[PDB]
Each structure stands twice: as C-alpha cells, then as structure tokens.
Design a protein around this ligand. Structure first.
Ligand SMILES: Cc1cc(C(=O)NC(C)(C)C)cc(C#Cc2ccc3c4c(oc3c2)C(C)(C)c2cc(NS(C)(=O)=O)ccc2C4=O)n1
Length: 302
C-alpha cells in the first residue's frame, strides 16, 4: 500500500484493549448491524482489576465501514465529559470489532422511562428507584443532565443529530448520560423514517426536514422533544401519526401538546426549543440553567 494523498498524522490517543481482557457474559441488546454485551473487563482500571462494562460488537463489513469505526472511536476519545457515557477504548484485535463503554445499570432512558410510566404493564424498580412514576424533581434532574451533556457538545461545535431518550443511558443513582446507537436496534425502528437513509423525523426541526441543515440550534429543537419524551414517560412524539403526517406537523408549525405530568414552566422551555427560526431558539446553556433552576425547586403542579 503506497501513499498518494495528503496524510494527516495528528490523531486522538485511542485506548486499545486486548481481547483476552474482555470476557463476554451475555447479550444486553441487538440491532441489524451490531450487538451490545455485558462483560467483565480485566486490567482496565487500577485497584478495580475486574469490572463490569458494556461492549458493543459492530459488524463493520467494508474498508469504509472500518474507517467509520476508527473515525468514531477517535471522536469518542476526544469528546469525553461528565454527562457523556464513558468510553474506555476499542478492540480491533480479531473480529468482530469491539467498543468498550461503562455499564449503565438501567439501560437506555426510553426503556427506563416506559418501565416507570403509569401505563407500564409490569412495575420495574430496584434499590435506587421507587417502582411506578418518578418525582417531578427526578424528571427535571434527568433532563438537566442530558442538557448538560449537550452544552459540552455545543462548545466543541458538535451536533448529535439523533438526540432522543433511546440514545441516553441511565446508570446507578439515576445518573443520566448521553450516548448513541448506530446499530439500528429493531426496538427503535419506528422512530426512524426510511426511504430507499434513516432519519429520526419526529425529533428533527423544520430546517433539517425542509432545508437539509443541521446546526447546534437543531439539537436544541431535538432536546425540546426529549423534554417531551421525559414527561410522557417515553411515549413516541406524534404516536398516532405516520412519518409523513409527522413531517406535515413539523413543517406546518404544529407543536406537541403539553404532557399530562408536565408543568407549564417546563412546557415553556419546550416551546422555546420549538421556535421555527433557529436563531430565535434559546441557547442550550439557557435551557440547561432554567432546568437546573427548576430542579433545585420543583414547581407545584396538579
Ligand atoms: C457510537 C457511540 C457513540 C456514543 C457517544 O457518546 N456519542 C456522543 C459523544 C454523545 C455524540 C456512545 C455510544 C454508546 C454507548 C453505550 C454504552 C452503554 C450501553 C448499554 C446499553 O447500550 C449502551 C450504549 C444497553 C441499552 C444495551 C444496556 C441495556 C441494559 N439492559 S438491562 C436494564 O440490563 O435489561 C443494561 C445496560 C446497558 C448498557 O450499559 N456509542
């Protein structure tokens, strides 16, 4: 293989994990192009010679696929922060290619929210969470932490483009962190519009649908929808409507209704996120600060 293009040396110090140090216990989740496993990982952290981790096994077929894998591994090494799920490294030794993340006890935020909702067919609960509905303060803490993660991404001129509760993870003590899923889980497929391309239509603003534009202000719109998700306990936006009908709502300026468990003060934040003009939307810092204020002193609501 010979060099015939500009070569950029500069790179992220991506941590490589030996495959022998990863011990797969069992499958946690599955998608069309990947699996998530629970695993024990040796020699990863000090004085914690053994620890539980979430291991993504990704089916990267082409050379282009493995380039995307390396590109992503590079970005996640750079983007490490407090409300972003912790990425420990990769295993490109053999096949499949693995990405190692921290174990988040309660899984993704959508499934978590659904399991604590009023319409939950079974009660989910543990040592850290009470079965059934969460507190208003707990709901605000969740949103506030997600917002905090978005502040950091916006600071680095970085757009998620698929900000939704399904891509947020929930750990012990109800610590919420932003992650992502490229594996196309069969559980969250109706959340994406398919033609020929996969678009999270119901979470996307007018400018993305109409003009194909995505900025940090588009993530603010998407966060407003996450806020709606949280206060409906993981219900799908426009759940009655089809993908095209939902596109009609967003492009005609028809907004999501105030949830049953949502105070007007919290709905005002959502409405602020859903301004048609991106420049007219509140900054993610301003949204975060307002959520954090409300989390310290939750409003009274019936
Ligand atoms: C490419 C990529 C980018 C990023 C990322 O930061 N992007 C930015 C920086 C935000 C843009 C993040 C990621 C990831 C990840 C990740 C990390 C941990 C987990 C876990 C799970 O899924 C996970 C995914 C599932 C949901 C599968 C799980 C289910 C359980 N189910 S249960 C209660 O036991 O029934 C238990 C635990 C977990 C779990 O820990 N990937």
């Amino acid at each position: 293989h010979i060099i015939e293009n500009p070569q950029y040396f500069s790179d992220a110090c991506v941590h490589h994990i030996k495959r022998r140090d990863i011990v797969l216990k069992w499958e946690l989740g599955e998608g069309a192009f990947g699996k998530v496993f629970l695993a024990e990982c040796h020699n990863l952290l000090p004085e914690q010679d053994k620890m539980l981790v979430a291991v993504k096994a990704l089916k990267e077929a082409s050379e282009s696929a493995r380039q995307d894998f390396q590109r992503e591994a590079e970005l996640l090494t750079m983007l490490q922060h407090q409300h972003i799920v912790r990425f420990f490294g990769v295993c490109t030794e053999g096949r499949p290619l693995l990405m190692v993340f921290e174990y988040m006890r309660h899984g993704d935020l959508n499934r978590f929210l659904r399991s604590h909702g009023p319409d939950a067919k079974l009660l989910a609960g543990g040592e850290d969470v009470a079965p059934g509905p969460l507190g208003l303060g707990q709901l605000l803490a969740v949103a506030s932490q997600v917002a905090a993660g978005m502040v950091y991404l916006a600071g680095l001129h970085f757009v998620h483009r698929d900000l939704a509760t399904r891509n947020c993870l929930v750990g012990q003590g109800l610590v919420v962190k932003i992650g992502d899923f490229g594996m196309s889980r069969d559980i969250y497929s109706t959340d994406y519009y398919r033609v020929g391309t996969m678009l999270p239509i119901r979470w996307m603003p007018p400018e993305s649908i109409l003009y194909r534009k995505f900025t940090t202000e588009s993530d603010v719109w998407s966060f407003g929808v996450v806020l709606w998700e949280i206060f409906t306990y993981g219900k799908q936006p426009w759940y009655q409507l089809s993908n095209t009908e939902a596109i009609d709502c967003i492009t005609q300026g028809r907004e999501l209704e105030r949830p049953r468990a949502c105070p007007p003060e919290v709905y005002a934040i959502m409405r602020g996120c859903w301004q048609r003009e991106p420049q007219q939307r509140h900054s993610i810092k301003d949204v975060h600060a307002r959520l954090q204020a409300l989390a310290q002193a939750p409003p009274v609501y019936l």
